[PDB]
Design a protein around this nucleic acid. Sequence first.
RNA 1: ACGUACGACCAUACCCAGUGGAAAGCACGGCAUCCCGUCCGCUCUGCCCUAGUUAAGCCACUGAGGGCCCGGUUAGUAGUUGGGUCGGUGACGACCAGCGAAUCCCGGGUGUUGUACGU
RNA 2: GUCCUAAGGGGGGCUCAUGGAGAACAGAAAUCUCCAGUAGAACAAAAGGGUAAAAGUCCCCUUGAUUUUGAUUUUCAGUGU
Lengths: 70, 65, 169, 188, 129, 286, 266
Amino acid sequence: EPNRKWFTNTRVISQDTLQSFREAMAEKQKDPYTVLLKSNKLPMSLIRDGPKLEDGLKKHQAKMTIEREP
Amino acid sequence: ILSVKKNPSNPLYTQLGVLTKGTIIEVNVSDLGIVTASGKIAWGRYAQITNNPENDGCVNAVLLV
Amino acid sequence: KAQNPMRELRIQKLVLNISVGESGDRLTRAAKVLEQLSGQTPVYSKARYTVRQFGIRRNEKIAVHVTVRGPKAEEILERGLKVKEYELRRRNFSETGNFGFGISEHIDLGIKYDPSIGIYGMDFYCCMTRPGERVAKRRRCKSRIGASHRITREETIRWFKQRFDGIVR
Amino acid sequence: LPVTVEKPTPYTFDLGLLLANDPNPVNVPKTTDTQVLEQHLASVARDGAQVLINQLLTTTTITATKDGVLLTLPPPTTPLPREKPVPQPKPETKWQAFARRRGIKPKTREQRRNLQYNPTTGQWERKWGYKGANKRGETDPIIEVSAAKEAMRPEGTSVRGDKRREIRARVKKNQKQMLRNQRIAAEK
Amino acid sequence: KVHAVSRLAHRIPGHGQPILSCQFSPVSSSRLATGSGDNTARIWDTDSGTPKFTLKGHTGWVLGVSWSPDGKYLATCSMDTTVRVWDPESGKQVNQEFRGHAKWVLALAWQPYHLWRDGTARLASASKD
Amino acid sequence: KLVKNSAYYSRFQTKFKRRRQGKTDYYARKRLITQAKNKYNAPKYRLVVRFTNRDIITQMVTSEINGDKIFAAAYSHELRAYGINHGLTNWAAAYATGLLLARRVLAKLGLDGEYTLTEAAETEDGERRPFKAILDVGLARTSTGARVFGVMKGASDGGIFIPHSENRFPGYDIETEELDTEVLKKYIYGGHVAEYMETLADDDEERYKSQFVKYIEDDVEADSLEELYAEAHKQIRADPFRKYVSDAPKKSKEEWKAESLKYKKAKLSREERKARVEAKIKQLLA
Amino acid sequence: PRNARSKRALEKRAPKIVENPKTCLFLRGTTCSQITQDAMNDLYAMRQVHAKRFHKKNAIHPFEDATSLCFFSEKNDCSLMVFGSSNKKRPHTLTFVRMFDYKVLDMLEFYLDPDTYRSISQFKTSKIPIGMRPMMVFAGTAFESPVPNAFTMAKSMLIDFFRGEPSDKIDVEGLRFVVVVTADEPQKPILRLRVYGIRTKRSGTRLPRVEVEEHGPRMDFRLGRMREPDPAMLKEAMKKAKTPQEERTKKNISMDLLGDKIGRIH
RNA sequence: ACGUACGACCAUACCCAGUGGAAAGCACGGCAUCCCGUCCGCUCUGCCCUAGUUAAGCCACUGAGGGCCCGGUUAGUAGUUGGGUCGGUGACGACCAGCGAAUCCCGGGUGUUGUACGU
RNA sequence: GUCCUAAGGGGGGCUCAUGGAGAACAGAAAUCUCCAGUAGAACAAAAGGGUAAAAGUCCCCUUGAUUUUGAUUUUCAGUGU
C-alpha cells in the first residue's frame, strides 16, 4: 500500500549523542567477568575510530600509482 | 540491513525475515551522508528489494525517497 | 454646533432586496435583474426556519440582495423616486433616520423588458449617516456614536425635502 | 567583603524546588522600630539568598546552550502531597479475563489496520467507517435480490439498508456489552 | 573578537543555477559577490538581504569571483575562456573582456595593492590550457 | 417589557477595561506572555508594533505583575533626525523605525559593580547569544504586505532574533511558494511610493499635487527616495541615539503642570453639592 | 465525553503518574475586609498562571462544612485554595485549603496583622515577571518540630503555593526573586512573609555578592485553627509513583556507556 | 497635571443625557497605482498628514434614575454544635463555652496606579 | 427512506436568541436595514461562577483511516528481526 512512513527517516541521532558515544567508545575497557547480553543498535561507522594513517595510505597506494602512471 | 519491515506476501514471511522481491527493508544509510532539517543524522531508512535474491545470490534495493 | 460641516447628512448605503420565496429559476432571474441593475454580483439569502404555511425549508435560498454605496446608490434611488413620483409617506421614514420603499415592476425603473427574466418587484432601503461612522465600524477601538450625532426622523425628512424636492404626506 | 556566611547550624537545600532551609534561630529584636525590624529580616534574607546562589553555582552542572546558561537541577526531595491518587490498573473485563484464561494474544497494530486490498477492483479500501467494506453495495447501481428473501422482506424496507441494519444490530450488542462491563466495574 | 555565527541571517534567491563561488568585499561585509553556473555573477546587499547588481555577459559558468584588494574592481573568470572586470558600485563592465586563454579559466589572483606599479593593477588567471 | 432593569444591571458583568476600550486582545496576550515550550524560568521579550494616522510606534516590552515595562522604544517621528520628513507611516518608514529600535536595543545592551549571573557562570565554551523577541501585532490584520512585518523585517535586519517566516512579506507568491526579493527591495527602499508618484505625474497631475504637495514643496523627487532611505539606514546604524527636537512648544514639566491645571475643572465638594441640592429643593418648592 | 474537546478535558483531569502543576482557587466569604482582599490580590499576583479567581460572595465556613469547597475543587480542578473572611473574633483571616482526590486533605488558618501589612504597590521597585517562579528561603527554628504542627503544615502549604512548575533546568537569569518565610518556636509566634529582589555585585572572587531589595508584599500571620489529615488519606496522598523512565534495578544486569546490556558473572 | 503606546486591579470603571477641551497627541478625514480583501475600498489593506473639524470617538465636569463598592449597626444577635454543666428519671429549661448569619437601619463614594515617550 | 472530499486539528473574520422602528407582494409567521440587546442563542455538561474579537458560527490549509525509536514500565511469547 502507499504510505507516508516509507519515505521518512526511521532512525535519527544528534551530534551531541554521537560525541558522547565516541567518548564512551574511547573509554571502553575489557573485563572478563562481564558478558554482553544485548547489543545496542547504533550507527557504529560514525562512532568507531577510523583506520590508521599508514593503512589508509597503503590501501590506496596501488590505485594511486596506477592513476598517476597507467 | 537493519530489519525487514514488510514482506508483501505474508506477515509470517515478514516475521521470518524473508528477503524477496518487493520486500520493504530497513537499511543503514550512514555512508550516504543524509542529515535532517534539524541537523540530526539520519542513519536508518527504508528500501525496497528490486530483484530476486534466491535467483541472483545478492540483495539489490532502491531507497524510498 | 449644528452648522459644523461634519454633521452633514449623506447616504451611507442603499440595499436592494428581492424576496421571491422560492428557490430555482425565479431566484436566478431575480439575481440576474439585481446584477444588471447594480453592476456587481448579488447575494443569495437562506431561510432561517421552516414554515409549512409559506412552503419554505430551513437552509433554502429564498431571497437575493445587493448593497450599493457611493454615487451609484444615489442614482439608483433617484431612479426609484422617479418611479414613485417623489412622494413618500410618513411611516416610510424610521425612527433611526433611515428610510425605504418598495416597487412592483423593475421595468418601470428604466430597463428594457425581456421575456426570459419576467417581472419582479423589489425594495430599496437607504441608510442615512453623518461622517464619523468609522467609530462604530472599525475593528480597533470600536465604540458608540454620540446622542447628538444620531439622525432623527425629522432630520432625514427635511433632508429629503430640501435635497430631492419631494413631498412627504 | 565576604560572600560566605557562618552560622552554628549549616543550611540544608532542595535545589529541585530552589528551597533553602535555615535551622538557625532568627533573633528578631524586641523593639518597636519597623526600620531595624525589616533591616534584620533583610539581612536574614540576604544570607539565605547568598547561600542558595552559592550552592546553585557550585554544585549544579552548567551547560551553555543557545537559549542561555542553564543549571541542571536534581529532582526535588522535599516531600509534598499529591492532588490525585496514583493510577491503578482497571478491573478486567469479560473479554480480557476470557482471553487471559484462553491464551488469546492481542492483535498487532499492522494486523488491526483499517485498510485492505480489494482484488476485483484492484484498489485499497477500508474495512469499516466512511465508504467501508462493511457497507459494500449500498451505493452500487444494480443489486440482485432473491425472490424468497424479498417476499419475506417487510413492506417499505429495501435491500439498500440491510447492511446498515446489521451494522446497527452489531453496534447495539457491543454497546450493551460495554455498559454491562462498566456497571460491573462500577459495582467493584 | 569575532563571535560564532549561530543562525541564518538571510536566504536570498535569484541565481538560476548552482552557485560556484562567493566572496565578500574587503571594505565591509555589506557587499557580497557570488558567481554561479547561470553564466552570471551577482552583487548582494547583505544588510537588507537584497540583490544589488547582476553582472551578465559570460557565456559559460562563472567559476571564479575575486575582489580587488582595494575593493574597487571585481574580476570574474568563467568557463567560456574569458575574464571580465566589473565596477561593483555601478554594476557596469570595465573596458572589454580579457581574451587569450585557450581553455577553461579556473582561478584568479590580484596583485597586492602595495605592489601596483605604472599606475595600474595586474591580474593573474590560471587556466586548463 | 423593559430589558434594562435592576436585575439586569445587578447581574451584568463588565469586560476588562481595555477590552471595553477595544485596545487589547487578552486571548492573544495570554498565549503570548504566559505560554512556553521551555520551563527554564527565563525572561521573555515582545516587540509591540502599533500604527496611528500619522506615526508608527515600536516598543520592546517585558510583562510584570503590576504592569508592562518598556525596555526600549522608537517612533517614526524620530526619523526626521535621520532625514525622513515625508511618508512617516509608509512601509519604508516602518522598516526604518524597526531598524532604529533594533539598533537602540543593541546599543542599550552594549552588543552593538553589578554584573549578571550569565557572566558569573559563563563557561569557557560559551558564545554570545542574540537578543530574542516575539512579534506583537495587536489587532492588526496579518495579510501579505502589512507594515507590522515591515517593522519586523527592519528589526531582524538590525539584529534582533525574531522567529518568523517570509510568506507575509511583499512580493511573496503563494502559488510557487517563492518570494520576489526585487519587489521586497523596492518596498524596503520605498520604490512603490516612487512608482505612485510617477504614475500620478503622468496621468492625474491634480491628484499628484494634492497627494504629494509636501514632496514637491520640499523638493523630494521620486528618484531620490532610494538613496535617501539608504542614507537614513546608514545614519541609523551609525548613531542610534541621535537627539531630535520638535516644532511643538517647549516648556518644563512643572510649567506644563501649571498650564494643564489652569484648564482643569475641579470636582465639587460636599458643601457645594449640598448647597446645590438645597437650591434645587427650594426651586422645586417655589 | 462524545466531544473531542470534552475528551481532552477529561484526559487532562484524569490522574497521572506525573501530575500537572497544582491550581489555586482564590475566593472570599460573605464578609471580607479590604486588607484581606488586597492580600489575596498579592498572592494571586504571585501565582497568576496556575490560579482561578471567584468574584462572588460564598456562604461558606470551612471548619463547619466543606462540601461546597469539595464541589468547587471538583468543578475547577483546583487542589489549593485561598479563602478570605472576616469576623469580630478574627478580623482578617486567610484560610489555606489543600485538597486530595477532590476531598479535603488539610486546612490551616492564617490571621493577618492589619497594621504591618504592606501591599506590592507600596514598594517602588521592579516587580517579578509573569509566570516566573521565585526561590524560597525558610528561616527559624519553628519548622524543625519533631511532631507535625501548624508551622510544619504552614511550611508545606507555602512551599506548595510557591512551587511553580517542576523543571530539571533553570536559566541563571531566572534567579532574581526570593520569598523568605521566618518563624520561631516559643505568646503566639508570628510567621513573617517577605519578598525580595536579588541584585548581584562583583566581589573579586568567582562567586558573586548577593544584595536584596524589598519587593512586597509584607505579611505577618498568626497561625490559628488547623484541620489535620486522616492517616490513611495522608498515606495515599504521600505515596510517590515511579516514572516509567525510572529503571527497576535488576541484580547483575546493567546498561553500559554504549547502551549494551551487560551481565555480571561471579 | 494633560496626551499617547503597552498594561495591573477589572462597574468606585457599568446603563442614559448635557456642557467644555489651551498645547501637542489621538481621532474623524482625503485618494484606490502598488501589497491585500469584500455583494459593496462598509470592514481589512495600501498611499497622503496637505486641507476641513472638535460634530462624533476620547478626556474632564455635571445630572437624574438604577446598579456597584466600602465602614458601622444588626451582634456575638438569631441559628448551630456540644447533659457541655446545673436541675430535671429521661425528653428537655436555663446557664456555660466554642463556632457563628442575614434582613432592616445609618454614613461615605462613583476610579486608583506602573513603565516608556512627549505636550 | 435519503445525503455527505469523514471526523478531528490549527489559523483568521464575525456575533447570537429576542424586542422596537421601517421596506411591493409580505399579511402574528418568508427576506432586507437600523437601534437596543451578559449571552436569556448555539455547543458541551449537569455550577453553588462552562464559553463572546469564543469552547458559538462561517472561510483557508491538512485530512496521512491510527507514524518511527527506545537498552525504560506492565503483561505475554515453542513463530524470542
